[PDB]
Structures are given as C-alpha cells and as structure tokens.
C-alpha cells in the first residue's frame, strides 16, 4: 500500500515518465490494468516502455497476435531502448514459433541502425550493470569504469 502511495505521488509529480508508468501498470491489479491504467498511459505518452508494457500485458492475457503486433510496433518506434528484445525473445520462445524466435533473435543483432545499444538497453532496464559486466563486454577499459 505504501508502494502504491509512493507510485501515485511519483506519477502526480513526475508525469510523462514511461518507465514509471509501465511499472505502475505492474503495481495495478489485473482487473484494473487494461481497463483504466493502460488507456490513460497511452494517452500520456508513447514511450517504447509504453508499447513494451502493452505487449507484455497482452502476452499475460495470451493475446498472441496482438502482442506480436505491439512488439513489432515497439521495435519500429525505438531500437536498443528499454531492453524489449529480451521480452520479445521470451514471448517467442514461450508463445511464438521456433523459426519466429530465431528470426526475432537475429533481428536483435548489435548494429548501428538496430539494437546498437542492446547491452546498454539491458543495463538501463534489466539492471545489467556490474563490475564484471564491462569486462564481459568488449570495451573493458571504458565501459567497466563508466558503468557500475
């Protein structure tokens, strides 16, 4: 309940926050997520976190085609942001086809036009920053010291 009060205060004082709004969806109960939260949330902003949250909600309702379409829209609207590639691959593994999962994984290749900062997106969203995270990455000297 105190977490809900804090989230409501944060939304009131810091609107247009894609990550905060998406995580507020996860605070809200399932009967109250799609009915009221997601609509006003989409009205507020169209962040890649917004589209990722909509796709995740559809996947949680097992709306496979709707979730896939929203994931495609998320990919088109922004790349290497929000670490949505991991969620898309998980959805493909658990709901999509094996060939579809392989195609999704291949499209997540680290390249300047698409998924250039995929590791950076994972660090920013899935909290992949670590002392050995930079060492695992190619940029041992720079990334390890810049990141936590």
């Amino acid at each position: 309940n105190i977490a809900n009060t804090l989230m409501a205060k944060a939304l009131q004082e810091c609107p247009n926050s894609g990550i905060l709004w998406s995580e507020a969806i996860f605070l809200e109960a399932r009967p109250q997520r799609r009915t009221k939260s997601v609509d006003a949330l989409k009205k507020c902003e169209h962040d890649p976190h917004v589209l990722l949250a909509v796709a995740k909600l559809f996947w949680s309702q097992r709306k496979i085609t709707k979730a896939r379409e929203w994931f495609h829209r998320t990919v088109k609207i922004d790349s290497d942001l929000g670490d949505a590639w991991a969620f898309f691959y998980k959805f493909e593994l658990q709901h999509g086809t094996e060939e579809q999962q392989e195609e999704v994984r291949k499209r997540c290749e680290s390249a300047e036009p698409r998924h250039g900062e995929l590791w950076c997106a994972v660090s920013k969203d899935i909290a992949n920053w670590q002392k050995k995270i930079g060492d695992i990455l190619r940029l041992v000297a720079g990334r390890i010291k810049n990141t936590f």
Binding site: A29, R30, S60, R62, Q94, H95
Partner: protein, 376 residues
C-alpha cells in the same frame, strides 16, 4: 516449470493460511477472527491469480492439442474442466454426458464441430501427464475456493451485516471474494461492483442480448432475479448502488445490527414496487368535432417554407398531365398503373428537360440526425 512453481506456492499457502481458516471454522463448529477473515478474503484473490496462471499454462499446453477451445470456452475454470474431460481424446466429443454439466448445449455443439476438423496434433505422454496434474491441482484449488466461500458465507453475519442483509449471503461472499476484500469492495465505484464476476460469454451465433453481457453476480442475486427481464438490468444497477453504500458502511463497522441494511432494503423494495406498479387510469381523448367557418392561420417565413415543401413542383405538375389520343407504352413492368404522363412524352411543350426542384429533397429528421451523430 511455471505449473510446478505455482502448485508449490499454492500448497505452501494452503498448508498455513487455509489450515488456519480450517481451524477457525472448526472452532465454532488473542488472535481474533478478523485476521482470519481478512487472510481468507485475500487468499481468494491469491488462489484466483494462481488459477489464472494455471489456466494460462493449460492453454499454452493444449494449444498444441486444440488451438481453438480458448475462444470457444472463455471461462478459465470451464476451460480446465473441459480439457480434463477431453484430454488428448477428441473423438470423445460425441454425446459426452459429462460435458453437459460443464458446458451449455450451445457450445458443446460448437466444440464438437471444431474438433471434427481441427489441425491440433495429439499430445504425447509427457504433455498428457503434465496437463493432467495441472488440471487436478486446478480443480483442487477450485474446491478450496468453494470451501473458503462457504466459510465467508458463514461469517457474513459478522463481516458485512448490512451488505449481507441487502443481498444474498452467497452473493455477498462471492462479490467480496472477487473484489479482494471488504475494504477493496468498499473503495470501488457503484458502477463497477455490478460488473464483478461478469464472464465474457461468447455469442454462439446468437445476439449479444441473449448472452446478457455486462451482467455480474449482483444481476444474478436473489432479489434481482425476482423481476421481469425488461426490469432486470435497471434493478441490478439500483441494487449495486445500495450494495456499495452497505460496503461503505460495513467497511467502517457501523450499524452492526443492520439498521442501515433495513433502511436500504426497504427503499429498494419501494423502488421495485414503484417500477412494477400498475399503470394509472388515463382517459381517452374524444375525436375532435368537424371544423367549419374560418380559422386564422399566420403567414411568414415558416409558411413560405412549408408551402415550398408541399407545393406542386414543375416536374410533378408535368407528371400528372396525360396526352390525349397518343398512347404510350408502359415502361414499368412491375406495375401498369404508373406512368410519367407528359414527363418524357412527346408534345409536352418542353424542349429542354424539366429540372429537379431541390426544395423537395428528402432529408432525415432532427432526432434521426442526432442518433446518426451518436452512432458515428
């Protein structure tokens, strides 16, 4: 997997909180009863969520066997019972006596038709055992939910006295269970309580009205079901509103005897009587006498417009002129009694074609325009 983790969590919860509820129930057969009631009314939501997880996993597994039963059977518990009674055996679909008690005859026909020519492959033994244990655990949790709802019905006299007075005790227990608690239900708007437990029944070719959508547990309560169908939906709304008030009282523990309950139920009965009251006596208007003399009627812009609308148009004036002697072939096979007269006929005195008076254009009413704008 997800099924194993959900089953382990459900068993852990049942070994402690459900056991505490069982001891509390058996005691009446400093640890007050309030915490037991609250933990039970949270356990209902916990088991509903874990049953949703189980139903999702069962859907994912059975999509290989039968990728269509999800749309055909919307209810989660009905889905679980259906897959339990079907399994890999889809030829069993014919004349299932067990399917009758779960699914209505309207949808058993549809599921049999779909399974006749479905593309779902037959599951292997590992999928069969996984699905069977999932269904067994799901039905066990459903039985636990039924027992805890029986407990809440028994405790209705203590938890929500006024709200138990307004409606049926079983309905009260069900609505608090689906809402998440007395406090959770009391915080909900009245227009939302009546939507509690409104399963998305699929129309099997029938109209949406046959489905009776946007109908909740309050709509199926004792008092609401005792009304004619045309008076049902409205009644539900009223009850819901009053039910909300009861919660907004019961959540603060006021009128534990139920005085607010009576003060609301009597007015509910009064509203029902008023709605069902016999129509009053209405005198019939005698036919007005025939008119004679002159009655002064004004002229002006409205009179000019009405005269233009109802006046004889040039094409209409030329229509009812029929040429003498010169016979015209009837161009309307469907009716010989219709002719254009001089309109289009030789000797009409018009070298050019008679244009259309747009003052006689056909247009919709104001209320029809309003309805069209609403339906847009």
């Amino acid at each position: 997997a997800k099924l194993w983790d959900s089953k382990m969590f459900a068993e852990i919860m049942m070994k402690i909180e459900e056991y505490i509820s069982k001891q509390a129930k058996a005691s009446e057969v400093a640890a007050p009863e309030y915490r037991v009631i609250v933990d039970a009314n949270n356990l209902t939501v916990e088991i509903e969520n874990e049953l949703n997880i189980i139903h999702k996993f069962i859907r994912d597994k059975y999509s290989k066997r039968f990728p269509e039963l999800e749309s055909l059977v919307p209810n989660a518990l009905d889905y679980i019972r259906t897959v339990k009674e079907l399994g890999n055996s889809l030829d069993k679909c014919k004349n299932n006596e067990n399917l009758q008690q779960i699914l209505t005859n309207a949808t058993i026909m549809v599921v049999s038709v779909t399974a006749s020519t479905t593309q779902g492959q037959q599951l292997s033994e590992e999928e069969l055992e996984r699905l069977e244990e999932a269904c067994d655990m799901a039905l066990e949790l459903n039985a636990s939910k039924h027992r805890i709802y029986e407990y809440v019905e028994s405790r209705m006299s203590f938890i929500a006295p006024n709200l138990s007075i307004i409606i049926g005790a079983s309905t009260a227990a069900k609505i608090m269970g689906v809402a998440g608690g007395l406090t959770n239900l009391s915080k909900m708007p009245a227009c939302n309580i009546m939507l509690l437990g409104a399963q998305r029944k699929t129309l099997s070719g029938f109209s949406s009205t046959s489905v009776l959508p946007h109908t909740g547990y309050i709509y199926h309560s004792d008092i609401v079901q005792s009304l004619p169908p045309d008076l049902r939906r409205k009644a539900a709304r009223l009850v819901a509103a009053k039910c909300t008030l009861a919660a907004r009282v019961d959540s603060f523990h006021e009128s534990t005897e139920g005085k607010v309950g009576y003060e609301l139920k009597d007015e509910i009965e009064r509203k029902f009587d008023k709605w069902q009251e016999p129509p009053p006596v209405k005198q019939v208007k005698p036919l007005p006498a025939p008119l004679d003399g002159q009655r002064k009627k004004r002229g002006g812009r409205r009179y000019r417009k009405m005269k233009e609308r109802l006046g004889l148009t040039e094409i209409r004036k030329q229509a009812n002129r029929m040429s003498f002697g010169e016979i015209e072939e009837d161009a309307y096979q469907e009716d010989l009694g219709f002719s254009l007269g001089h309109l289009g006929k030789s000797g009409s005195g018009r070298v050019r074609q008679t244009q259309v008076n747009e003052a006689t254009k056909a247009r919709i009413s104001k209320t029809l325009q309003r309805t069209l704008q609403k339906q847009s």
